[PDB]
Amino acid sequence: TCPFYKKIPGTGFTVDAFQYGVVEGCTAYFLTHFHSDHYAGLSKHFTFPVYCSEITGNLLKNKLHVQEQYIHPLPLDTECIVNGVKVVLLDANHCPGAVMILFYLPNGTVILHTGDFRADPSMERSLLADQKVHMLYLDTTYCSPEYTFPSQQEVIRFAINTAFEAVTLNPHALVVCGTYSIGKEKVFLAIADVLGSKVGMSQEKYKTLQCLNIPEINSLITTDMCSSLVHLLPMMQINFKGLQSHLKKCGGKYNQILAFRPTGWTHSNKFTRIADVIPQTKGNISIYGIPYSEHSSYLEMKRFVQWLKPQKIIPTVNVGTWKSRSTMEKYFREWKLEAGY
Numbered sequence: 001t002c003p004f005y006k007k008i009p010g011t012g013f014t015v016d017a018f019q020y021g022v023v024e025g026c027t028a029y030f031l032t033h034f035h036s037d038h039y040a041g042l043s044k045h046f047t048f049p050v051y052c053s054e055i056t057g058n059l060l061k062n063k064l065h066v067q068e069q070y071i072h073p074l075p076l077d078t079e080c081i082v083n084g085v086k087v088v089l090l091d092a093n094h095c096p097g098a099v100m101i102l103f104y105l106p107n108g109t110v111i112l113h114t115g116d117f118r119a120d121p122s123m124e125r126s127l128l129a130d131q132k133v134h135m136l137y138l139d140t141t142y143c144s145p146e147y148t149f150p151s152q153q154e155v156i157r158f159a160i161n162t163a164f165e166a167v168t169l170n171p172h173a174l175v176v177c178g179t180y181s182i183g184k185e186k187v188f189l190a191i192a193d194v195l196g197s198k199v200g201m202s203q204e205k206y207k208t209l210q211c212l213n214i215p216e217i218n219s220l221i222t223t224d225m226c227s228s229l230v231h232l233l234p235m236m237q238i239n240f241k242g243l244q245s246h247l248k249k250c251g252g253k254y255n256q257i258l259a260f261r262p263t264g265w266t267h268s269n270k271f272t273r274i275a276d277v278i279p280q281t282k283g284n285i286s287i288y289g290i291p292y293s294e295h296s297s298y299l300e301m302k303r304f305v306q307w308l309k310p311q312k313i314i315p316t317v318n319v320g321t322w323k324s325r326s327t328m329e330k331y332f333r334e335w336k337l338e339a340g341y
């Protein structure tokens, strides 16, 4: 049964609610982004209207085989009427195709559902500038002050310089980047661009990347592994055993691996600056964990909320324990007292 924080009151709508069977009264199912916890339940047998971005729609059709007649893509930054209700989709700054949804309810209430997002000051100059929001359904993944991490630009600068140094010292080194979902593509694209290489990968991952509307993608990726010195591998293979096994398959072309594991936050963020990050090393294999986040830091989240000044906040992450719910409620009240709304 569908929980309350996935329903939009006063409408026939749900958000990211495909794992509950047929939801009573639902006339349109919104999907914020193509991550498995959110799409859980969709397939070729789904026969209700799905509303989403263009990119999410390409993934639903090609990867999950949802039939074309049930996929309803909407453009971004554009007022659209769905089942008699005005909606807008906004870029969430999460993975490719990810959106926030603004709903203009028939009674005058305005609701923003962030989906998953990485708040940014640029959002203060979207269509959100123009009006009041009564209810915010908020991605609270990192809603605690211990959650700190650098900008995505700093993290990419670190990865490019690390890869470029290693391969210039040793032309026979291979770079490997872990993946398990869409998102974080800048990590492997930036490294391959500095090395003058295409990115090599499986047929299955190539298919996924071909759905993402990335400009000039045919120039950047390939399924011919032997032609490439940046390889993508499943995240589970990014360990000394998996990497050893991969280096055997390359036919004595390479004699060293440098690997990257993009994570979210880890507690080594509580002590170490990005610049000071060191790898784990066994023999001719080195593995870097890099804190490339596609969710708001505490401070980015707080800035956004204090600017938007919502009347009520409904968290969508960390909702399962009393201690988490209490902690989030305390911070929301501080933020409101501090800013005066």
Ligand code: NI
Pocket: 033, 035, 094, 116
């Ligand atoms: Ni996500």
